[PDB]
Structure formats: C-alpha cells, structure tokens
Subunit: 30 residues, 4 copies
C-alpha cells in the first residue's frame, strides 16, 4: 500500500544519510 511505499522511501533516505555522514567523517579525518 501507499504507507509501505513511503516507509521504504524513508529507510532508503536514512541509509543515504548514513553514507553521507560516513563521507563527512572520512573528510574530517583526512
């Protein structure tokens, strides 16, 4: 249903944010 589609999109964006945070950590360390 529409709710499941939205939840899946939220999880995907959360994972993208984790990947960006990792990149920031990598840049911060050097």
């Amino acid at each position: 249903g529409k709710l499941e589609a939205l939840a899946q999109k939220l999880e995907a964006l959360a994972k993208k944010l984790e990947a960006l945070a990792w990149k920031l950590e990598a840049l911060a360390q050097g």
Copy 2:
C-alpha cells in the same frame, strides 16, 4: 574536530529516521 562532530550529529539523525521507518512499516503491516 568540528566536521567530525557534525558527522556524528548526522548519524544521530539518520538513526532517528530509520526508527521512524520501522514504525511506519509496522503501521503499514498492521
């Protein structure tokens, strides 16, 4: 330093988003 602190704040937000995704998915499955 400041970038690492920012990355940790981003990770904290991403964790809260994922928690919301599990909650929305449970509502969808219920």
Copy 3:
C-alpha cells in the same frame, strides 16, 4: 568544493524528507 557538495546533498535529502512528511500527513487526513 567537497564539503559544499556534501552540504548541498544534505539539503536535497532534507527536502525529500519534507516531501515525504507532507505525503504522510496527506495520507493521515484522507
């Protein structure tokens, strides 16, 4: 512009989250 590029990606992600919140609220009101 490595940090500026990441900041732009973070802003875009936030706007996608805001669109999802709007869609969830629209589903709630339906």
Copy 4:
C-alpha cells in the same frame, strides 16, 4: 492520529537536517 504524529516527527527531523546542512556549508566557506 498516529500517522500525523509520525509525520510531524519526520518534519522536525528534516528541519534539524537542514540546520546541519547550513552548518556544513558555513564551515566550508570559512
């Protein structure tokens, strides 16, 4: 009800992410 409460939590998280994106851009420019 619940969906609206969850949507508001998501909107609040998105706004916090925007503040973090702003802070990253500010750090990058100075």
